[PDB]
Amino acid sequence: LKESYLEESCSTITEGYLSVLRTGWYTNVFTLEVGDVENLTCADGPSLIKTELDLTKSALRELRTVSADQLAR
Amino acid sequence: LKESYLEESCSTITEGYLSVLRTGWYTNVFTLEVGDVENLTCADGPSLIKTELDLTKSALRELRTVSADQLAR
Amino acid sequence: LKESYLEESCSTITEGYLSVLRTGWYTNVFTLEVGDVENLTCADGPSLIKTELDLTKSALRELRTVSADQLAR
Amino acid sequence: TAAAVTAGVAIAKTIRLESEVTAIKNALKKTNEAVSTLGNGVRVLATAVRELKDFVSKNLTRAINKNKCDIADLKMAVSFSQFNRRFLNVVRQFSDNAGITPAISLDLMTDAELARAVSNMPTSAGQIKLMLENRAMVRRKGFGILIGVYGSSVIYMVQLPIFGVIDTPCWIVKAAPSCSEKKGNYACLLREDQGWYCQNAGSTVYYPNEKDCETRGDHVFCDTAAGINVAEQSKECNINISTTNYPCKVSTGRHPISMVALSPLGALVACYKGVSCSIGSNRVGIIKQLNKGCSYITNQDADTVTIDNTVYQLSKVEGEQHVIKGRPVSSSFDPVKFPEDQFNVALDQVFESIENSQALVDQSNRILS
Amino acid sequence: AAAVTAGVAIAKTIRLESEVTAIKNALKKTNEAVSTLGNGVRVLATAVRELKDFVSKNLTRAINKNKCDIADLKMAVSFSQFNRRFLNVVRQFSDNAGITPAISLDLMTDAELARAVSNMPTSAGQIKLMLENRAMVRRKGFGILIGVYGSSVIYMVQLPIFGVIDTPCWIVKAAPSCSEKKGNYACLLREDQGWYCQNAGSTVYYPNEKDCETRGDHVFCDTAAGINVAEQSKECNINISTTNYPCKVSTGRHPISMVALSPLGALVACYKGVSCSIGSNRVGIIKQLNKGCSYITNQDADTVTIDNTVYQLSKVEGEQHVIKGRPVSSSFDPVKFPEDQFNVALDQVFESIENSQALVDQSNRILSS
Amino acid sequence: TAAAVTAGVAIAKTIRLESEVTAIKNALKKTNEAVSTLGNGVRVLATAVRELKDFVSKNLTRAINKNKCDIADLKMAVSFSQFNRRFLNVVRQFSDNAGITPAISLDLMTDAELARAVSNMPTSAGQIKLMLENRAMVRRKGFGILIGVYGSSVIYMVQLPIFGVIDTPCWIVKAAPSCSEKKGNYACLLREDQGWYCQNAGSTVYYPNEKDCETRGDHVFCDTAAGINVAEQSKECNINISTTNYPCKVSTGRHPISMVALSPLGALVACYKGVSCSIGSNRVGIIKQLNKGCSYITNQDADTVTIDNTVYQLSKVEGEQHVIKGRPVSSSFDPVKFPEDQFNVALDQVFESIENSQALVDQSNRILS
Ligand SMILES: *[C@@H]1O[C@H](CO[C@@H]2O[C@@H](C)[C@@H](O)[C@@H](O)[C@@H]2O)[C@@H](O[C@@H]2O[C@H](CO)[C@@H](O)[C@H](O)[C@H]2NC(C)=O)[C@H](O)[C@H]1NC(C)=O
Numbered sequence A, B, C: 001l002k003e004s005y006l007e008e009s010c011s012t013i014t015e016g017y018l019s020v021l022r023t024g025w026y027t028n029v030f031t032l033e034v035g036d037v038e039n040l041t042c043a044d045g046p047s048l049i050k051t052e053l054d055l056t057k058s059a060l061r062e063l064r065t066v067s068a069d070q071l072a073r
Numbered sequence D, F: 001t002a003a004a005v006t007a008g009v010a011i012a013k014t015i016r017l018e019s020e021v022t023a024i025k026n027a028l029k030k031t032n033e034a035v036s037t038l039g040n041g042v043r044v045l046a047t048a049v050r051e052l053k054d055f056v057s058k059n060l061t062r063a064i065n066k067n068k069c070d071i072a073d074l075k076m077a078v079s080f081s082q083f084n085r086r087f088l089n090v091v092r093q094f095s096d097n098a099g100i101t102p103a104i105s106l107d108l109m110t111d112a113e114l115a116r117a118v119s120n121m122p123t124s125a126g127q128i129k130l131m132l133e134n135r136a137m138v139r140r141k142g143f144g145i146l147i148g149v150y151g152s153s154v155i156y157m158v159q160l161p162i163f164g165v166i167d168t169p170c171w172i173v174k175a176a177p178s179c180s181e182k183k184g185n186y187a188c189l190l191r192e193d194q195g196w197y198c199q200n201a202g203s204t205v206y207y208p209n210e211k212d213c214e215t216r217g218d219h220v221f222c223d224t225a226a227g228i229n230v231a232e233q234s235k236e237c238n239i240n241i242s243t244t245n246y247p248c249k250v251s252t253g254r255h256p257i258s259m260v261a262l263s264p265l266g267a268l269v270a271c272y273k274g275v276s277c278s279i280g281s282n283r284v285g286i287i288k289q290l291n292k293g294c295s296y297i298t299n300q301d302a303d304t305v306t307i308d309n310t311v312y313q314l315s316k317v318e319g320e321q322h323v324i325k326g327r328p329v330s331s332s333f334d335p336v337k338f339p340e341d342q343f344n345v346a347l348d349q350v351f352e353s354i355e356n357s358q359a360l361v362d363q364s365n366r367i368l369s
Numbered sequence E: 001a002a003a004v005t006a007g008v009a010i011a012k013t014i015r016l017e018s019e020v021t022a023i024k025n026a027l028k029k030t031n032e033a034v035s036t037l038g039n040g041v042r043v044l045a046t047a048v049r050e051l052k053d054f055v056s057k058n059l060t061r062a063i064n065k066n067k068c069d070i071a072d073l074k075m076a077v078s079f080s081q082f083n084r085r086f087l088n089v090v091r092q093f094s095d096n097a098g099i100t101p102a103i104s105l106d107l108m109t110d111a112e113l114a115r116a117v118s119n120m121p122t123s124a125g126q127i128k129l130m131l132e133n134r135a136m137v138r139r140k141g142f143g144i145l146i147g148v149y150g151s152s153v154i155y156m157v158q159l160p161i162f163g164v165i166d167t168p169c170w171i172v173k174a175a176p177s178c179s180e181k182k183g184n185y186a187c188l189l190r191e192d193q194g195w196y197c198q199n200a201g202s203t204v205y206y207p208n209e210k211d212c213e214t215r216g217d218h219v220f221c222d223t224a225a226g227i228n229v230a231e232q233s234k235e236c237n238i239n240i241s242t243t244n245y246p247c248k249v250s251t252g253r254h255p256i257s258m259v260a261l262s263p264l265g266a267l268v269a270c271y272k273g274v275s276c277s278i279g280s281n282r283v284g285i286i287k288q289l290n291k292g293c294s295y296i297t298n299q300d301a302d303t304v305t306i307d308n309t310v311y312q313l314s315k316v317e318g319e320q321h322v323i324k325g326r327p328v329s330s331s332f333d334p335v336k337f338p339e340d341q342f343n344v345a346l347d348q349v350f351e352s353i354e355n356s357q358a359l360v361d362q363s364n365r366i367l368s369s
C-alpha cells in the first residue's frame, strides 16, 4: 500500500485498497427435522431418553414462540 | 402499504407503516439455583459426576468475575 | 453526582463522571489442542466415542474454512 | 459205606459253601471300593461346585456391582445436565458475551414468564396486545444483564422495552441526486430529509438511517436513541420542496452523480453523463434502457438495474432449498435368560436317584434280618 | 455213631446254606443302590456342568458386553469433559464465523486475563482500574480465529489498553427552547449534545449517548466515535451567546414538544397544543406542567406525559423469580449373595463323604479278619 | 470210620465258616451305611446346587438385564445428541438470539452448502471466486432468520451478501487540525473529508467512519447502508483543499487543538501551545520530541506517540502466547474371564470316577455270578 502525507491540509490519504461492494441478497431456506428414535420398552416410566425427548420437545415449543410468521404460533 | 414517487425532488415516500415506539424499560430479576445431587459413595474418587460438578463449580467461579456489582467478587 | 439545569438553553449538564479511554490494543495468542483419546477396540463398529471424535473432527474441518489466514485452508 | 454216602455229601456241600463265602468276601471287597470311588467323585464334584460359587459370589457380582455403580455414575452425570439445563444454558450465555446478553434468550426468560411480565407492564391494554404478538421483537429489542454469582446461585436481570406509543402514522423517505443541466453546467439537488419518519404527539420523530427502524409487516420498531425530533411541518417537503413554511433540508452540487437508491417497493435511478443505465428481468436480459435523468421503477416492474457493468438487485434472489434429517436412533437391548426347565427336571432326577438308592440299602438291611 | 455226625453236618450246613444266599441277595441289592446313586451323581454333575456352561459362556459374555458399553460411554462423557474449553471455544468461533463479540470466559480465563492486563504497557493505576472493571475489558475486546492446523485451534485475543483514566467527564442533553411574542415562534436548540471527556491538550466529544458506557462513575468511551473539540467549547454551558466559541445551535420557526431524558432527571418541552403532565407510578397525575421548558428530577416524579403518551423517567422494576432444578439421585442397588447358609451345606457335604469313607474302611477292616 | 472223619472235618469246617459269614454280615451292614451316608452328602449337594442356580437364574440375571437396560437407555440419550447435533445446535442459536442470527454460522449452513450457493449466485466468474475466497466475510456479512417451527421441523432462512462490484480502487482519509499562528492568535482549518472512499461506476462512494468498512488484506468490505454517493471530482480535495472545482468539506476554528490521529501506515500529530508532544518506542519513553505544528510519522518510525502524559500506541502490542492440551482420555475396560480349562479338568475327573465306581460294582456282580 502507499500512504501519502498531505502537508497542506494536515491529512493523510492511504490508497491501494480494492473494493468489495454488496449489490444484493441471495437466500437459501433450510428444513431441519429430528431423526426417528426407537421406543425403549425395556424400561418403565422415567427413562433418560424420554426425559431427553420431552426436553427437546419443549425446547421446540418455546422456540416456536419466536417464529417469523404469526401463523406458526 | 403505498409508495409515492415525487418527481420534482427525485425522492420517494412510502406510507402506510405503523409505529412501535419505546417509552421505557421494564425489568425482572431472576435467581437460578443448581439442583441437589446425592453423594455417590459407591465409587472411590474420580466419578464422572464429581468431575462434572467440580467443572460447573469452576464455571461459576469464573462467571463470578464479570458480575455487575463489585460486592459479589 | 451533580446535574445542573441551564434554563437559558433549555439544557442539562451532568458532571462528576470519570474517563476510561482506549489508547491501544494488547494481544495474546492461544493454541488449544484436543487431548489424546485411546482406541476402544473391545467393541465392534459404531462406538459412541468413535462417532464423538468423527464429530469433533468434522467440526474442525468446517471451522478451518473460516480461519483468518488463507494458508490454513 | 452207608454212612459215607451221607457223610461224603456234607463235606462236599461244605466245600461248595466255603468257596461261596470267599467269593462274596471278594465281591464285597470290590463293592466298597466302588462306594469309596463314587465318594471321591462327589468330593471332586463338590469342590467344583465350591469353585463355581466362589466365582459367581465373589469375582462375578464384583463385576456386576461395579458396572452397577458406573451405570449410576453416568445416569447422574447425564441427569444433572438434563435437570439443570436452564441454569447451564444461562451460565453459558453470560460467559460467551461476558456478563451481558444481546437478547432476552429463551433460556433467560421463558415464554410463560415473558408473557406474564408484558401483561404487568405499566401501559394501555392495546399496547400490551401488540407486544404479545411481536414478542420476538420485545426479546431482541430488550436484553439481559448478569448481576452476580452468589455462592452457587446465578442472579441476572432481563430488561424489556415498554412500547408506549403504537399504531401512529409512519413513513420513509428515499432520494437520489436530481441533477439538471443547461449548456454543460450541472445543477444538482439532493434531499437531506432522507430516512424514517414516525408521527408522534406534538412532534414528528425522524430517524436518519434505515437500519434505525426494524420492519416486521406494517409495523416499524424504531430505536429511541436514533430519533431526532422535527417539527411536523417538515412533512410538507413531500408536496412542495420549495415551501417557505419549512426549511426543507436540500444540498446543491455542481457535478453529476449516477446511482441507484432502493425503496421498499422500488428504486430511484440517476443516469447522467457517461453511464449505461438499463433495466433487466428474471429470464430475459434487457427490457428497457433508461433515459438520462431521474427514473423511478417498481419491484413489479423489474428485478434489475444495471449501471455500466454493475448489476443491482431490487429484491431478494431466491436460491436453493434444503432439507436435512438426522440419523435414526435405535435400541440395542438383548436380554439374557437361563433355560431353567431342562435343568429343573434333571435335579428332580437326582433327588429321585437318591431316593431309589436310599430305599435299596433298606431292602438290603431287611434281607439281612 | 458215624452216621449221627453226618446228619448234624448237613443240618448246620443247611442252616448256613440259606443264610449266605440271603447275604448274596443282600449284596446284589446294595450293588444296585450304588449303581443307582451313581446314575444320580452323574445326572447332578451334567446339570452342574450346564450351569457352568451358562455362567462361563452366556453370562460373563453379557457382563463383558455391558462392561464394554460402560467403558465406551465413560470415554464419550470424559472426552467432552476433559475438553470443555477446547469444545466451547470451537463452538463460539463457529456460531459467529471466525470472530467473537467479546473475550469470553472460555477464550481467556480470569487468571490469563489478569496476567495480561498486568503486563500491559501502562501505569500502576491504569492496570488497577482495568483489573477492577475487567468485565468491560472483555466486552470492549474481541477474539479472532487465526487458523485450524490439523487438530489444533490457534486464535488471538485482542484487549483494550485503557491508558487514559480518571479525567473529568460530563454529558449534555437539551430540548428545543421555543420563545413566543405575538403568536410567532422563535426556537433555538443546542446541537452540542453528547458525551465530553477531557484529555491532555484537548476535549473529546462523543456525539451519541450510546458511544460511552456507564459503570458507576466511570465512563468507557469508544475511541472511534470520538471527535476532538477546543477546550473552550465547555463555555457553552454558561452563556450560549458566548463569542469565545462558535456555539453549535440550531434555530427554528416551529414549536417542538418533547421529552429528553437526563441521567438524574428529564427536560420537558410543552408548547402549543399538548397536555404535558407529571405523574407517578403509585399516584396517577401529580402536576400539569406550564408551557415552556421544564426540568424535573428522577426523584421529583416517575413519569412525564405528553397528551396520551406516557414517558418513563426510570426503569420499572417488575416481578422477581427464583428457580431450582430437579434433584439428581443415585440408583445404586448392589446385589449380594446369601453365602453363610450355603457354605454350611458344603461342609455338610464334605463330612458325609468322609463319614461314608470312614465306613468303607471299617467294612474292609472287618473283612481283613 | 472214614465217614466219621470226613463228616468230622465237615462239621469242624462249618464252625470256621460261621465266623467268616458273621464278619461278612457285619461288614455289609457297614457298607450299606456308607452308601446311605454318601447319599445324604449328594442330596445336600443337590439342594446346595439348586440354590446356586436360583441365584444365577433369578437374582443375578435380573441385575444384569437391568444394567443391560440402563446401558441401552444411556446409549440412546447420547446417540440422540450425536445423530442430531446440527438440529440441536441450530435450535440452540435461534434461542440464544430469539429468532435471528448475527452471522451465518457453521451449523446454519455447512461449507459445502455455502460454496454451492455462492457458485449459484447471479454474478460474474471473478466475483464468485472472490466470494469463495473470503467466505468467512460472506458468512459474517450475512445472517439467519427463523421462519417457523412446524411440528417437529425447524424451518429457517440464510441470507447471503452478493458481492457484484469488486476490485475497484479504494482509499481512506485521515486528518488532524492544521493550525497556523500569526502574532499570538491561532487560525485553524480541519478537513471533514475523513473516511472511506470507494470508486464505483458513475460515482464515488464515501463511508464516513473507519468502522463502516472492514479490511481483510487489500480488500475493503463496505457497508452499503453507510455509503454516501459523492462526485468523482471530490478526489481533487487531496491535492488542493482550496480548489474551486469541488466544494471541499473543511471547517475552520479560532482555537488550537492538539491531538493524535492514527493512519493505516502511520499517525498524524498536532502539537500546539502548551503541550509536550513526543514520539516514543516500546522500551524507551522518548526518542524524539515533536515540533509544534502538524507532524506525520510512520509505524516504522516509532511505536508510540505521547501527548503530555497520555501515551498513544501506533501498533497492536504483542503479549504472551499460550498453548493448552486437554487431559488424556483413557479406557476403563477390564473384562472378566472364567477359568474353564481348570474347571473342566475337575468335571472330567468326576465323570471318570462315576464310570470307575460303576465299573467296580460290575466286577462285583461278575464275582457273584
Ligand atoms: C483404531 O482401531 C481400529 C481397529 O484395529 C483393529 O483391531 C485390533 C484389536 C487389532 O485386531 C488390529 O490389528 C486391527 O487393525 C483400527 O484399524 C482399522 O481396522 C480395520 C478392521 O478392524 C482394518 O481393516 C483397517 O485397515 C484399520 N484402519 C486403518 C486406517 O488401518 C483403526 O485404524 C484405529 N484408529 C486409529 C485412529 O488409530
Ligand SMILES: *[C@@H]1O[C@H](CO[C@@H]2O[C@@H](C)[C@@H](O)[C@@H](O)[C@@H]2O)[C@@H](O[C@@H]2O[C@H](CO)[C@@H](O)[C@H](O)[C@H]2NC(C)=O)[C@H](O)[C@H]1NC(C)=O
Binding pocket: D240, D241, D242, D243, D244, D245
Ligand atoms: C411550490 O411552492 C413555491 C412557493 O410557494 C410556497 O407555498 C405557498 C402555499 C405559499 O405559502 C408561498 O408563500 C410559499 O412560498 C411556488 O413558487 C413561488 O411562489 C411564490 C409565492 O410566494 C411566487 O411569488 C413565485 O412566483 C413562485 N415561483 C414560481 C417559479 O412560480 C411554486 O409555484 C410551488 N410549486 C408547485 C408545483 O405548486
Ligand SMILES: *[C@@H]1O[C@H](CO[C@@H]2O[C@@H](C)[C@@H](O)[C@@H](O)[C@@H]2O)[C@@H](O)[C@H](O)[C@H]1NC(C)=O
Binding pocket: A008, F240, F241, F242, F243, F244, F245
Ligand atoms: C490551490 O488552488 C488555488 C486556485 O484554485 C483553483 O485550483 C485549480 C485546481 C483550478 O481549479 C483553478 O482554476 C482554480 O483557480 C490557487 O490559487 C492556489 O495557489 C493553489 N494552492 C496550491 C498550494 O497549489
Ligand SMILES: *[C@@H]1O[C@H](CO)[C@@H](O)[C@H](O)[C@H]1NC(C)=O
Binding pocket: D058, D059, F336, F337, F338, F339
Ligand atoms: C478372582 O478373585 C480373586 C480375589 O477375590 C483373585 O485373586 C483371582 O485372581 C480372581 N480370578 C479371576 C479369574 O478373576
Ligand SMILES: *[C@@H]1O[C@H](CO)[C@@H](O)[C@H](O)[C@H]1NC(C)=O
Binding pocket: D336, D337, D338, D339, E057, E058
Ligand atoms: C448361549 O450361547 C450359545 C453360544 O455358546 C448359543 O448357541 C445359545 O443359543 C445361547 N443360549 C442362551 C440361553 O443364552
Ligand SMILES: *[C@@H]1O[C@H](CO)[C@@H](O)[C@H](O)[C@H]1NC(C)=O
Binding pocket: E335, E336, E337, E338, F058, F059
Ligand atoms: C433375591 O430375590 C428374591 C426374590 O426372587 C428376594 O426376595 C431376595 O431378597 C433377593 N435377594 C437379594 C440379595 O437381592
